[PDB]
Structures are given as C-alpha cells and as structure tokens.
C-alpha cells in the first residue's frame, strides 16, 4: 500500500518551508493540509527495523522522501507552538522520526520544551499540547545543552509531581539520565533539593527513580556528597514518619548505593 500510494502521489505536484510560515499570519486550510500531508507521507515509511536496512527498494521510497523534500523543519518543529499549534509539530516529528547522528539530538533540543513548564502554570486549550505531547516528546528517548533539558523538563515533570500518562514522562527522564556526564552528575542529586521538599507520592517516586541511577555518575568519576548525607538523614528521620515506603525505603537502602560508588525550589 505504502509503495503504490507513494508513486501515485509523486506523479502529480502536491518553498515548502515558506508556506507554513507565510500562512501563519493570515482560515486554517493550508496549515492543516500540509501537516496532514506530512502525516500521510510519514505513515508510509519503509519499516522501523532491519527490514528498512537489510532489504532492497524499501530504500528507494526513503530516498525519494528526502530527495524531493529536504527537511527545513524549524518552521514546524519550532515556530508553531509558542503562544494548529500542537498537532502540526506532532506530524513533523513523525516525519523526521520515521525517515531521518548524535549531534542532531542536541540540535533540536530545547525547541518547544522551554514553553512547556511556562504554559503549564495555567492548567488551558493550548495547554493540552502537553497532554498530547506526553507520548511524542517521550518517544525520542531513542555537556553542551543537555543540562538545560533536565533543567526544563523536570521543571515540567515537577508540575505533576494525563494522570496515569505521567508514567511516560517519568521514564522519559529516568532513561534520559541513564545515558549520561558532569552536569548529569550534578543532576544525580537534583531532586534532593526537592526530596527535602517532598515530606505528592510522585515527588518521592521522582526521587526513587533517579536514586538507583544516582551512583552510576560518581562510580565513573570516583561537594554535595555531604548534602547526599543530609538528604539521607532527612530520609532516615522521614522513614520514622511512615506500600508507604515501597518507593521510599527502596531508596533508603539504596543510599548505601549512594555511599557505594563515590567511596519545589
């Protein structure tokens, strides 16, 4: 199906970075039509696995997709969701994801996610961009600017620390830290500033999820290790305060893991 529709489309005709920008000031026809074309042309990918790699003429459509359409994607991945707004970018991320290397992960980073924690403070209609994006900003799970992202996105995640869909944003940070190296090592104690501000239960789960992966950073390179003891002491006194410790006391013995590798706000 993919192949035949692609050929059909290419017979006919239909600055393609200029159209989504020039119509943005000017009645929602072409800015929706082009995003739907992006969604259609991105759905007919060759594959998602070595079928795309280790086969023939699944690559031909992939070449045609980048040959008649080079990206220019900043008109979609940046300029549309900073006040239509969530969905058009949600098509473009799929078209870039299916068809299109470690430099590019930092290239588009903090584009859009900076508005997330800003507009999250009025939870409305364009603030359902985030409940929409709880999957499509997480699926790019697969130090220059990365210290910004753990700055911003955790400041979005602490906005809820939609309801059961926050588990996607949880693994979006617990696995983003896991591929750390110095700024992330300082981020291995970031929630300790909120573990003292902990005592919903998700605020303690955000402590526990990074608690086990905290020791990987100071296992590699080995100031606030005494502050880790200060958080362990607030956890030792907070253990007397309390499935209540199923996310708490799992990290409490794991503070010996935090002692096993180095040696709100």
């Amino acid at each position: 199906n993919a192949n035949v529709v692609v050929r059909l489309l290419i017979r006919r005709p239909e600055g393609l970075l200029a159209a989504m920008e020039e119509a943005i000031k000017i009645g929602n026809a072409i800015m929706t039509f082009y995003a739907a074309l992006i969604d259609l042309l991105g759905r007919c990918a060759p594959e998602m696995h070595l079928i795309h790699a280790a086969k023939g003429e699944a690559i031909r459509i992939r070449s045609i997709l980048r040959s008649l359409i080079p990206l220019g994607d900043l008109v979609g991945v940046i300029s549309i969701a900073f006040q239509f707004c969530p969905d058009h970018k949600a098509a473009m991320v799929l078209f870039l994801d299916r068809v299109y290397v470690q430099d590019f992960l930092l290239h588009l980073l903090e584009v859009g996610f900076l508005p997330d924690l800003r507009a999250a403070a009025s939870l409305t209609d364009m603030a359902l961009a985030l409940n929409r994006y709880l999957c499509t900003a997480v699926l790019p799970l697969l130090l220059f600017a990365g210290t910004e992202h753990h700055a911003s996105l955790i400041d979005s995640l602490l906005h809820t620390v939609k309801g059961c869909s926050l588990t996607k944003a949880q693994r979006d940070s617990i696995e983003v830290c896991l591929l750390s190296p110095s700024m992330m090592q300082h981020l291995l104690r970031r929630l300790v500033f909120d573990v003292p501000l902990l005592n919903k239960m998700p605020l303690k789960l955000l402590t526990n999820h990074y608690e086990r992966c905290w020791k990987y950073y100071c296992l590699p390179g080995g100031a606030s290790e005494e502050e880790l003891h200060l958080s362990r002491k607030l956890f030792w006194g907070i253990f007397d305060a309390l499935y209540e410790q199923e996310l708490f006391k799992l990290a409490l013995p794991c503070l010996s893991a935090v002692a096993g590798a180095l040696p709100n706000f």
Binding site: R7, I10, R11, R60, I64, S67, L68
Partner: protein
C-alpha cells in the same frame, strides 16, 4: 523491422517551440563532460548536426528476474519490459542517471562502471496499439524508465533530466559487411600520397593539398563522412547519394565555392548545395530504407569527386603542393583510392580537437 542488441540507434524527441517542429536528439559528450544535452536535427540544411555524439549501442537486454539475479552477485531481440543497457557508441561509456541537480528531478550522464542499477533502463510502450511482452519495432514512440531512480527520461524546458513526468523518445536504426563503406567512417584519401591540410601555428589551415610521406599516418589527414539522411545514416555507401566531408582534426567542413575557392568553413556555413559532393565510378538510386548492399571495396576503387551544384572535378594543380582545384575535366588521377582507419585513431582524433577547443577557451579567458 525490429531492434536487436549490438545495434546502432539514436534517441530523438520532437518538441514544438512556437509552431516550429524541433526534432531534438540526445547527445552526450564525454572526456570532460558528465552531462548530456540536445542536438538540433531540424535545421539540417544549413547547420549539419554532429552525429558522432548522438549514436548509441544496445549492449544487453535482460528481464528483471535475471537483472535482480546478476546484480545479487548472438543477437537477441528486445521486448517491452526488458531493462536495457545503452552505451555511447563513440566514447565507450554507459548512459545512466546521476544524483546531482540543476525541482525534484535528477540529471543524466555517462559513467564508466556498469554495476548498480544506475545504467539500466526498462522500455515502456506508449500506446494501447502495442502492449507488454511483445516485440519492438522500428519507429515506435516509447518511454524509458530508470531502474535506479524509478523516474522517466524527461525533456524539460533546456534540461534533459530524470523526472517524475514522462515524454516520448522516438528511435531510429543506424547500422547493424566487412571491407565496404559505411556512412560514418574515418578514412584517408589515397592518391598513389594522400589528401592533406597543412600543419598548425597560424591561414587557419583552410587550404587543401595533396602530399606524400609520413603525413599519411599522422592525425591531419582524417575525414568523416556525414550523409544527408537522419535515420539509416550508418547504411552502406552507394553512388549518387550526397554526403558532407568533415575534417576531423579541425572540425571544419570541406566546402566548395566555385567562384571563390575550395576552403573549410564552419557548421553554420555548410550549405547542402555548397559542399555535398558525390563520387562517381566514371568521370562523366536515391534512398533505400535499410543498410543496403556492398558497393565500394577499399583498395579496388577509383572514386572521382564531383559536386552537385557545379558538377566539376577536383583535380590537383601544378613541400609537395599539388593544390586541389575543381577543374571541368581533370586528368586521369582523380580516381582517388580509399583507406579506412581504425577505431583508436579516430578516438584519438576526436579527443584532440575536443581538448584543443577547450584549451583555447582557457587561454583566451586567461588573457582576458
């Protein structure tokens, strides 16, 4: 009737620019040019086309099953659905699609290597009057399809390029008998001692002599015949059909103006009554659609040169500088014998002038 492998064909698309039926032909250059262009064939009565850069050769013709096999590592006839391998009949390169650009099209040029899907083209019929699988015939307006780029060999407005849109490509037979004359040869004109144009460093060599010695072997005395027909221009050569003679080393046409002189003038001055000479067996048919039969053997020949418009006889006057002048009778030595050359000599001969005309452009652009 039909088209086979190891044949000689041309590719020719006829466009219309403001009610002017322009029969453009496909022409690649090679030896410094990886891109193809268009050759005019409509205005052939005052500016003759170049023929050596537009003829092709079909090498092989498989079905897609055998091509996908052989890629995974006699004279057959072609069927609409075979992926063929064109090649440039002079330069020796294989025609293909390239990943360059000049839109969402691709450019078309030659390459030396034959592997990959690049130099393979499946024919497609362009009629309901003939259909898949059946036999090709002469003059069928068809479509070509890239195997690699999955695109059509399109003529655009003057790019020839591989596009998503289609256009027609009429073909025409050219060639297919040892020891005889075929329209397209490169030959010397033996006297006893041969026809010559003098050495460089100038006249612009526009005089014509008869000479002897080692200049028989050298690259000056090379002449290419170009018959007035477009299709079947690589047939046999029989008496009575006219032909231009081109000097190969210089690229200027051997033109007679019976008042002025026998000189060498350019493509844009080569008139059909000015220079289209013919040989006669004595010193006193018109068109057959085929490669003809064997007329003129090489060593046993007395070719007496005679114009169409004047009908004179090029005889020598009185270095060895027996300068050729069209007389009304001539002597008994105008039966000039013939000697065809070999492929490597003509290959050197064309590339000499092709590099000369680029070096001189370099020199004048540097002196500017």
């Amino acid at each position: 009737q039909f088209l086979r492998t190891d044949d000689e064909v041309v590719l020719q698309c006829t466009a219309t620019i403001h009610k002017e039926q322009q029969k453009l032909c496909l022409a690649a250059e090679g030896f410094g040019n990886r891109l193809c262009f268009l050759e005019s064939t409509s205005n052939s009565k005052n500016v003759p086309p170049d023929l050596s850069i537009c003829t092709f050769v079909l090498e092989q013709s498989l079905s897609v099953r055998a091509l996908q096999e052989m890629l995974a590592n006699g004279h057959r006839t072609l069927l609409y659905g075979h992926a063929i391998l064109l090649r440039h009949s002079y330069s020796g390169m294989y025609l293909c699609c390239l990943s360059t650009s000049r839109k969402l099209a691709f450019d078309v040029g030659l390459q030396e290597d034959t592997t990959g899907e690049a130099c393979w083209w499946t024919i497609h019929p362009a009629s309901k009057q003939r259909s898949e699988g059946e036999k090709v015939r002469v003059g069928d307006d068809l479509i070509l399809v890239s195997v690699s780029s999955e695109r059509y060999l399109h003529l655009s407005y003057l790019h020839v390029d591989a596009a998503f849109q289609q256009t027609l490509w009429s073909v025409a037979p050219i060639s297919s008998a040892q020891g005889y004359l075929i329209g397209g040869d490169v030959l010397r004109l033996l006297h006893g001692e041969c026809l010559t144009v003098p050495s460089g460093e100038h006249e612009q060599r526009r005089t014509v002599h008869y000479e002897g010695g080692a200049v028989s072997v050298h690259a000056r005395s090379l002449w290419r015949l170009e018959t007035l027909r477009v299709a079947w221009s690589g047939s046999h050569i029989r008496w009575g059909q006219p032909f231009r003679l081109r000097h190969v080393t210089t690229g200027k046409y051997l033109s007679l103006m019976e008042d002025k002189s026998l000189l060498l003038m350019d493509k844009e001055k080569a008139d059909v009554k000015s220079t289209a000479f013919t040989f006669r067996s004595s010193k006193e048919r018109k068109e057959v659609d085929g490669m003809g039969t064997s007329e003129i053997k090489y060593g046993d020949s007395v070719c007496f040169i005679q114009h169409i418009g004047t009908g004179l006889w090029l005889t020598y006057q009185s270095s060895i500088q027996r300068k050729a002048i069209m007389h009304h009778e001539g002597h008994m030595d105008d039966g000039l014998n013939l000697s065809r050359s070999q492929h490597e000599e003509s290959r050197t001969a064309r590339v000499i002038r092709s590099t000369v005309f680029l070096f001189n452009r370099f020199i004048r652009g540097l002196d500017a």
